[PDB]
């Protein structure tokens, strides 16, 4: 029922030791963001961006399940993360 997500770092952003995750379809981009920040032992003041298709940054209230159904491929959704903006 859950969906597979793969997280990839952009630029010099820290790399997650564990990249492939199974998440509830109802989890939002913000929920995903909060998880990574405390996983990388980052801080709230530090902003973190998430990207789909290496193209656009979905609103943080968007659900991963919808993004998967629309932009997923080969059984997973690829999301890129970065401490700074990458694609406008």
């Amino acid at each position: 029922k859950k969906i597979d997500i793969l997280l990839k770092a952009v630029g010099d952003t820290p790399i997650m030791k564990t990249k492939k995750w199974a998440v509830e379809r109802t989890r939002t981009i913000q929920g995903l963001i909060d998880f990574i920040k405390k996983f990388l032992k980052l801080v709230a003041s530090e902003q973190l961006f998430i990207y789909v298709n290496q193209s656009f940054a979905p609103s943080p209230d968007q659900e991963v399940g919808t993004l998967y159904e629309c932009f997923g491929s080969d059984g997973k959704l690829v999301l890129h993360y970065c401490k700074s903006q990458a694609w406008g």
């Binding site: 859950k2 597979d4 997500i5 564990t18 492939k20 995750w21 199974a22 989890r27 998880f35 996983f39």
Partner: peptide
């Protein structure tokens, strides 16, 4: 093989 995020969050950061 994907790690369960719900498991980790409820296990111990």
């Amino acid at each position: 093989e994907a790690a369960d995020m719900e498991e980790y969050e409820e296990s111990g950061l």
